[PDB]
Design a binder for this molecule. Structure first.
Ligand SMILES: [Cl-]
Ligand code: NA
Lengths: 102, 102, 102
């Protein structure tokens, strides 16, 4: 399995996106939590309060998921970061696989 | 070293497990923080407030830690996610190795 | 690219250090959020509130970033954990590369 990390400007946009992904079976679970983002933007550093989203799904769904996220994300150029999970307990993997599309 | 990520239903169960893993020195450190989980639960999309736990330990203790977490975890099917650390400052690593069981 | 995870004792230090890293063009973005740390220290399990920081930058800047963080961090032995990003949307990578020093 893999985790995909992306961030949102608020809870409504974040929840809408994750629920849409769940409905479309592109991810099995999402963990959302707030954070303060500090970053470079057009010549100056910006500070925004965001909602980070840790998505859990299959490596086989990475490409499809990445493209779907692009279509749904409020940011024109959002962060869609893939970090592979080296290993996970068999019972959880079984669940994640059953809950996601082939 | 590796990072192990798992979620708990509340702060009480989270702290209990983490303190036990620490006492038994299966991990050297844990970072807990709340988040909102969204997932499929046998036919429907559920939402739950959880406490996520980021555990820091060594590769060699993965199997034993995974098994111990299974025994202590409040969920019958918990998420026990292993993500290897590609690199870390040598003095922190020495500390982590020294604090965990050999 | 890579994500670097480090923790701070408070927001003052967390913000000062991440902004310095941003201004020295060693990272493009940083996501900070509080968490509760539980860890072994000199024979006792300590507990402390911390500000965790997720830094995003180029793989090529790892060593410089690691050394710079060591030189700026309030902790004598901080956690400087590097986790490689297996893949990311090219549009974001383009921006990240453009915002970090060459
Ligand atoms: Cl996190
Ligand atoms: Na990896």
């Amino acid at each position: 399995m893999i985790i995909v990390y992306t961030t949102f400007p608020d809870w409504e946009s974040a929840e809408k996106v994750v629920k849409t992904l769940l409905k479309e079976r592109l991810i099995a679970c999402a963990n959302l939590r707030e954070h303060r983002a500090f970053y470079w933007w057009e010549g100056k550093i910006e500070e925004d309060k965001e909602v980070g989203a840790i998505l859990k799904t299959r490596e086989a769904l990475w490409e499809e998921l990445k493209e779907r996220i692009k279509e749904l994300h409020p940011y024109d150029v959002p962060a869609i970061i893939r970090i592979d999970v080296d290993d996970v307990n068999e019972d959880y993997l079984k669940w994640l696989i059953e809950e996601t599309k082939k």
